[PDB]
């Protein structure tokens, strides 16, 4: 059931998200990102992402409506 | 106006390649196709026409269709070469008409047999009762040497419409391109 | 040559529905339709298929019907709706292909360069891979066959696509499945493999006893070719082959040994980790 | 005459014909007909699905009559029950014109059904399928469904927000859908990912196998190198600041189990098949 | 004149598109593009765009709503030049 759980989360992306950049994280599973839309935001993250992919403002994707690090 | 599905059995065997008819059996049976297609056309456009040969690999050149221009396109370069085959001709004309989209049409068949046949009377009675099951009344107009006085064909017909059926008929093949409008003067609707 | 084909899961269901269509006759009505595929490569792709009216008697299997009209119109519709799709061959629901089956290919080799057959099995009692396809050739023989013509086995597989995997695999939730089951799918693999071995042996011995005595043709078809199968039969236990095993098996045993070695210690960490938190939270709780 | 707790019976081919059509026409609303059978006043059943050309206004219905005809003569005749199209990446909600075909259709057949599909929001685990049923506005105050059972009320799901922002109850009513599975297709659908005995009897290779183990052991050595420093390190920092400074490039104790698992599952089967190939053979 | 009226009838229902450039191909159907006026997006072609022609730096036309690549076009027109 857990492995069925991971896959069903995948519908969130569907491609057209946004190209933004990771900036910083406050705490566990919540960080800050400055989008290429000129503005900056405070957002949550998915538990699926590996935390070794961070550091020096990586290229990231975000939801159009939600604007969450996916 | 009656609903039926005409299935013609042309003869592109070798023995059609002669001149007991005035020009040629090809033109003779071809013209008889001309009168049968116009006949069913003027009877009912809902009716449909499909043709078959009697060669080694008896061919559905035209699936059962109301249009006749396709059949006329098929009549040309018919290549009457090979050997007359009968028992598989009535068979390929037999199992074919169960593929009909319209079922109100009565399964009719006309055959142009102009080569010496080698059938058996038990074969014509088995095929005859098999044609009793579906009641496929077939009227064959023979064009050339067919058999000894069209033997095994009036027996086939009578064993088809036995016990006063009189639906199928057998024509003759000794003089020439019989005007089938004259052959069906009384049997114009049902030969 | 084509040498393999990739059939999608849509077909093999778009045939089952039509076998269900005329499936009311029950006794026998062989389902025949049109196969649609792609001129992909030497390898060939199969995507679409559709049906066509077809009947055939019991005796003298030379009386069969494929509506060329229906084929022309319906494929005209499927080209109007998909020029990317095109005719590639044909199929029939026969569990075992019939002697008549060559005349059909030989008929519709004029539409496709070779209208490859497709045998499907509605009831594959064998738990192996069903729905295998053939392509006919000529193999004129020393006997003096004017045209030794017979189909050819061609390997095939099941196609896949992003969307269809989505919809199908969402349908697979009706039953349980362990596809991520570690070191389980392998065991199942050797199981079903050995099952296929035993099935093939029982079949070939069924044929072999029949031909051996009483009534069967004793042709030179296989009789020595399968003997050459006996020719290989590697004599496993011999002199240096022992050095083949013991010089590698212990190698992999060493790696497994190390893996267990670290696995034990890693398991041992959590004992300290939880034995600390339990009593340290207890003594502070009281 | 009154509504009920209706059920949408399907055909397994219908689903695939949906998703392949919509996916192929992903950048726009793809339209098609839903063909099935009116089993009763309570449930519906769809068995056949097909679409037509569109450059959403369908072109010549000469395709229609000939299509249904040739579908009747081959197979059998059936009944048109509803229809479908795509809302690509949308809220799977009946668009303004989508409802505009609905007074057209329900006026033709009573239980005309709209079918919304999105091959975009559907992940390989689960598909986002949908279908709706127009409701009158003249009875906006009067009751529309008798609600004589929990199934289409407190037993199904919950209306989504992006489609409730359009109708949610209004101009239509949702409907439940299930899957009927023939045993014939069920059995073959059960088995489509297995192989022949060749696969279960392969011995991959010991040169690239031993090469592979020689690979993984190498970096696994380094994983132990990091693991020593990390485990002994232990800043007294509370069990969550470690969980905030571990995001970064930190990963002991994670790859360590992984490489051990893979090195296990490789060597095990690799030995086993070689075992069987000699016990069984000769 | 009725023919002209029908012409405008057909002309009514045509919606424009967004113009952008192709940054890089992430996957066979995942692409990284940028609007000419600012931010960037992840998109996909339709089925048959001949994606081989799409290269980093080319220009393409995107769907307004679905936001996907339609009709990649030649270079631009620099209005300090045509004059
Ligand atoms: Zn819509």
Curated annotation (Swiss-Prot), chain A:
Signal sequence region: none
Cellular localization per UniProt: Cytoplasm; Nucleus
Role according to the record: Component of the 26S proteasome, a multiprotein complex involved in the ATP-dependent degradation of ubiquitinated proteins. This complex plays a key role in the maintenance of protein homeostasis by removing misfolded or damaged proteins, which could impair cellular functions, and by removing proteins whose functions are no longer required. Therefore, the proteasome participates in numerous cellular processes, including cell cycle progression, apoptosis, or DNA damage repair.
Annotated family: Belongs to the AAA ATPase family.
Subunit and partners: Component of the 19S proteasome regulatory particle complex. The 26S proteasome consists of a 20S core particle (CP) and two 19S regulatory subunits (RP). The regulatory particle is made of a lid composed of 9 subunits, a base containing 6 ATPases including PSMC4 and few additional components. Interacts with NR1I3. Interacts with PAAF1. Interacts with TRIM5. Interacts with ZFAND1.
Protein name: 26S proteasome regulatory subunit 6B
Organism of this sequence: Homo sapiens (Human)
UniProtKB/Swiss-Prot annotation, chain B:
GO biological process: proteasome-mediated ubiquitin-dependent protein catabolic process
GO MF annotation, one: molecular adaptor activity
Keywords associated with the record: Isopeptide bond, Phosphoprotein, Proteasome, Repeat, Ubl conjugation
Start and end residues of each VWFA domain: 5-188
GO cellular component, one term: nucleoplasm
Glycyl lysine isopeptide (Lys-Gly) (interchain with G-Cter in SUMO2) cross-link, chain position(s): 122
Disulfide links within the chain: none
Domain of life: Eukaryota
Subunit details: Component of the 19S proteasome regulatory particle complex. The 26S proteasome consists of a 20S core particle (CP) and two 19S regulatory subunits (RP). The regulatory particle is made of a lid composed of 9 subunits, a base containing 6 ATPases and few additional components including PSMD4. Interacts with NUB1. Interacts with SQSTM1. Interacts with UBQLN4. Interacts with UBE3A. Interacts with UBQLN1 (via ubiquitin-like domain). Interacts with DDI2.
Domain observations: The 2 UIM motifs are involved in the binding to a multi-ubiquitin chain in a cooperative way.
Record-stated family: Belongs to the proteasome subunit S5A family.
Name recorded for this polypeptide: 26S proteasome non-ATPase regulatory subunit 4
Organism the protein comes from: Homo sapiens (Human)
Residues included from the entire protein: 1 to 191 of 377
UniProtKB/Swiss-Prot annotation, chain C:
Domain of life: Eukaryota
InterPro entries associated with the record: EIF3F/CSN6-like_C (IPR024969), JAMM/MPN+_dom (IPR000555), MPN (IPR037518), MPN_RPN7_8 (IPR033858)
Presence of keyword Acetylation: yes
Single GO MF descriptor: protein homodimerization activity
All residue ranges annotated as the MPN domain in the record: 5-140
Gene Ontology BP annotations: proteasome-mediated ubiquitin-dependent protein catabolic process
Designated name of the protein: 26S proteasome non-ATPase regulatory subunit 7
Species of origin: Homo sapiens (Human)
Lineage, uppermost ranks: Eukaryota, Metazoa, Chordata, Craniata, Vertebrata
Swiss-Prot record, chain D:
Modification type Phosphothreonine: residues: 238
Domain of life: Eukaryota
A Pfam match: JAB
Keywords of this entry: DNA damage, DNA repair, Hydrolase, Metal-binding, Metalloprotease, Phosphoprotein, Protease, Proteasome, Ubl conjugation pathway, Zinc
Membrane among keywords: no
Motif (JAMM motif): 85-98
Signal peptide: none
EC number: 3.4.19.-
GO biological process: double-strand break repair via homologous recombination; double-strand break repair via nonhomologous end joining; proteasome-mediated ubiquitin-dependent protein catabolic process; protein deubiquitination; protein K63-linked deubiquitination; regulation of proteasomal protein catabolic process; response to ethanol; ubiquitin-dependent protein catabolic process
Tissue spec: Widely expressed. Highest levels in heart and skeletal muscle.
Biological role stated in the UniProt entry: Component of the 26S proteasome, a multiprotein complex involved in the ATP-dependent degradation of ubiquitinated proteins. This complex plays a key role in the maintenance of protein homeostasis by removing misfolded or damaged proteins, which could impair cellular functions, and by removing proteins whose functions are no longer required. Therefore, the proteasome participates in numerous cellular processes, including cell cycle progression, apoptosis, or DNA damage repair.
Record's protein name: 26S proteasome non-ATPase regulatory subunit 14
Species of the source: Homo sapiens
High-level lineage: Eukaryota, Metazoa, Chordata, Craniata, Vertebrata
């Amino acid at each position: 059931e857990f492995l069925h759980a991971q896959e069903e989360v995948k519908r969130i992306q569907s491609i057209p998200l946004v190209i933004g950049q990771f900036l910083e994280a406050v705490d566990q599973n919540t960080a800050i990102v400055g989008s290429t839309t000129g503005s900056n935001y405070y957002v949550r993250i998915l538990s699926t992402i590996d935390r070794e992919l961070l550091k020096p403002n990586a290229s990231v994707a975000l939801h159009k409506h939600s604007n969450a690090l996916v | 106006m009656v609903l039926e599905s005409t299935m013609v059995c042309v003869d592109n065997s070798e023995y059609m390649r002669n001149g007991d008819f005035l020009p040629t059996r090809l033109q003779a049976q071809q013209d008889a196709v001309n009168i049968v297609c116009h006949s069913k056309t003027r009877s009912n456009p809902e009716n449909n026409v499909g043709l078959i040969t009697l060669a080694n690999d008896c061919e559905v050149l035209t699936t059962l269709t109301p249009d006749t221009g396709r059949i006329l396109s098929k009549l040309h370069t018919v290549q009457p070469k090979g050997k007359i085959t009968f028992c598989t001709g009535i068979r390929v004309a037999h199992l074919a008409l169960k593929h009909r989209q319209g079922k109100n049409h009565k399964m009719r068949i006309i055959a142009f047999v102009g080569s010496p046949v080698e059938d058996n009377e038990k074969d014509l009675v088995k095929l005859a009762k098999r044609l009793k099951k579906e009641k496929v009344n077939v009227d064959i107009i023979n064009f050339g040497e067919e058999e000894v006085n069209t033997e095994k064909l009036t027996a086939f017909v009578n064993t088809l419409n036995g016990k006063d059926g009189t639906g199928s008929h057998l024509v003759t093949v000794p003089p020439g391109p019989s005007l089938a409008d004259a052959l069906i003067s009384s049997p114009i609707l049902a030969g | 040559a084509v040498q393999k084909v990739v059939v999608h899961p849509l077909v093999l269901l778009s045939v089952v529905d039509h076998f269900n269509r005329i499936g009311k006759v029950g006794n026998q009505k062989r389902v025949v339709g049109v196969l649609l595929g792609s001129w992909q490569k030497k390898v060939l792709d199969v995507s679409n298929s559709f049906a066509v009216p077809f009947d055939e008697d019991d005796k003298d299997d030379s009386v069969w019907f494929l509506d060329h009209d229906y084929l022309e119109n319906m494929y005209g519709m499927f080209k109007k709706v998909n020029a990317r799709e095109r005719i590639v061959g044909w199929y029939h629901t026969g569990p075992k292909l019939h002697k008549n089956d060559i005349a059909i290919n030989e008929l519709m080799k004029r539409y496709c360069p070779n209208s490859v057959l497709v045998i499907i099995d509605v009831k594959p009692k064998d738990l192996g891979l069903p729905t295998e396809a053939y392509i006919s050739v000529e193999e004129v023989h020393d006997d003096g066959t004017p045209t030794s013509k017979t189909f050819e086995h061609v390997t095939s597989e099941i196609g896949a696509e992003e969307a269809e995997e989505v919809g199908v695999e969402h349908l697979l939730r009706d039953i349980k499945d362990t596809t991520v089951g570690t070191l389980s799918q392998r065991i199942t693999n050797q199981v079903h493999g050995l099952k296929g071995l035993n099935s093939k042996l029982l079949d070939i011995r069924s044929y072999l006893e029949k031909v051996a005595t009483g009534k069967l043709p004793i042709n030179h078809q296989i009789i020595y070719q399968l003997q050459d199968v006996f020719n290989l039969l590697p004599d496993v236990s011999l002199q240096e082959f022992v050095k083949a095993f013991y010089l590698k098996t212990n190698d992999q045993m060493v790696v497994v040994y190390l893996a267990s070695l670290i696995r034990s210690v890693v398991a041992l960490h959590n004992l300290i980790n939880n034995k600390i938190a339990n009593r340290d939270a207890e003594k502070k709780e009281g | 005459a009154v509504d009920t707790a209706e059920q949408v019976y399907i055909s397994s081919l219908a689903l695939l014909k949906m998703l392949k059509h919509g996916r192929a026409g992903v950048p726009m609303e793809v339209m098609g007909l839903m063909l099935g059978e009116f089993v009763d006043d309570y449930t519906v059943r769809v068995i056949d699905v097909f679409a037509m050309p569109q450059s959403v206004e369908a072109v010549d219905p000469v395709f229609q009559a000939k299509m249904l005809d040739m579908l009747k003569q081959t197979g059998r005749p059936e009944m048109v029950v509803g229809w479908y199209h795509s809302h690509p990446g949308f809220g799977c909600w009946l668009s303004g014109v989508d409802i505009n075909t609905q007074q057209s259709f329900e006026a033709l057949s009573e239980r005309a059904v709209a079918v919304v599909v999105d091959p975009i929001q559907s992940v390989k685990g689960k598909v986002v399928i949908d279908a709706f049923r127009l409701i009158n506005a003249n009875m906006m105050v009067l009751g529309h469904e008798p609600r004589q059972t929990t199934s289409n009320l407190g037993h199904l799901n919950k209306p989504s927000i992006q489609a409730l922002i359009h109708g949610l109850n209004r101009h239509y009513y949702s409907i439940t859908i299930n899957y009927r599975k023939n045993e014939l297709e069920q059995k073959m659908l059960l088995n489509l990912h297995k192989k022949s005995w060749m696969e279960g009897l392969t011995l991959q290779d010991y040169s690239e196998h031993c090469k592979h183990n020689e690979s993984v052991v190498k970096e696994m050595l380094e994983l132990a190198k990091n693991y020593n420093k990390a485990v002994e390190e232990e800043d007294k920092m509370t069990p969550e600041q470690l969980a905030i400074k571990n995001v970064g490039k930190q990963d002991p104790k994670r790859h360590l189990e992984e490489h051990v698992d893979v090195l296990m599952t490789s060597n095990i089967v690799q030995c086993l098949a070689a075992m069987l190939d000699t016990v069984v053979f000769k | 004149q009725y023919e002209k009226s029908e012409n405008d009838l057909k002309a009514l229902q045509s919606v424009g598109q967004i113009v952008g450039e192709v940054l890089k191909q992430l996957t066979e159907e995942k692409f990284i593009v940028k609007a000419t006026n600012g931010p960037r997006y992840v998109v996909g072609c339709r089925r048959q765009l001949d994606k081989s022609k799409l290269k980093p730096g080319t220009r393409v036309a995107l769907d307004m709503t679905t936001l996907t690549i339609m009709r990649y076009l030649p270079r631009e027109v620099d209005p300090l030049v045509y004059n």
